[PDB]
Design a protein around this ligand. Structure first.
Ligand SMILES: CC1(C)CC(=O)c2c(C(F)(F)F)nn(-c3ccc(C(N)=O)c(N[C@H]4CC[C@H](O)CC4)c3)c2C1
Length: 213
């Protein structure tokens, strides 16, 4: 049940995004699907040389699950997944190398929407969410949960409370009260159709409806 501290660049970064009055917040969703697609690219690459890598979850998919009652939006994929080392280290130093670059770009006039070219698009989720849990399962490890309140610290804990993923990652975004449109099927459909034409993988949406009886 370990606590860790964000680097000063990432804490700076998270503070910008969570407090930004940036209007086009729907790009948060394009960015998380791009993280997902890359993770699926990666297991697909490995499974080419070692097809047993897919046995943990033979289906390759992205899945969006609005949880209206909890005001949480979940984003799941069957990509490579992340080990405990990956989560504790926030993927290491090379992955976040562009954080300062990106922040310098924003000072010069850049659109928050180019965050993904600096390799840190994950943190765009704080445009719409004030809290996040990241559940992940890598073939080389057990299942873990990373969690952040958008503060200086985050936690990583062995996963003994969530559905088994088999392989891959699920994000649960605790939506800011001004962003609940993104629990809506129509809104979610608008945004995926807009920004995700060239994602090679099926993008599934899970919508809960009452049976008129
Ligand atoms: C570790 C984090 C909790 C905090 C973090 O810092 C971070 C970042 C970073 F900013 F570093 F780029 N990116 N990022 C993230 C978030 C979802 C995923 C996915 N849905 O799989 C992901 N996939 C990578 C995993 C590694 C493989 O090489 C390729 C596929 C990465 C995270 C999640």
């Amino acid at each position: 049940g370990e606590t860790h501290e964000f680097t000063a660049e990432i804490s700076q970064l998270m503070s910008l995004i969570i407090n930004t009055v940036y209007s086009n917040k729907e790009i948060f969703l394009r960015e998380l699907i791009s993280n997902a697609s890359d993770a699926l690219d990666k297991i697909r690459y490995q499974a080419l040389s070692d097809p047993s890598q897919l046995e943990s979850e033979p289906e390759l998919f992205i899945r969006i699950i609005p949880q209206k009652d909890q005001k949480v939006l979940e984003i799941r994929d069957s990509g490579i997944g992340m080990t405990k080392a990956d989560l504790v280290n926030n993927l290491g130093t090379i992955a976040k190398s562009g954080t300062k670059s990106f922040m310098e770009a924003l000072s010069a006039g850049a659109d928050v929407s180019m965050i993904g070219q600096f390799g840190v698009g994950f943190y765009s989720l704080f445009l719409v969410a004030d809290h996040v849990q990241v559940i992940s399962k890598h073939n080389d490890d057990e299942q873990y949960v990373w969690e952040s309140n958008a503060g200086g610290k985050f936690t990583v804990t062995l996963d003994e409370t969530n559905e088994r993923l088999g392989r891959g990652t699920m994000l649960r975004l605790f939506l800011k009260e001004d962003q609940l449109e993104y629990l809506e099927e129509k809104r979610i459909k608008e945004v995926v159709k807009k920004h995700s034409e060239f994602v090679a993988y099926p993008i599934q949406l899970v919508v809960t409806k009452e049976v008129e009886k």
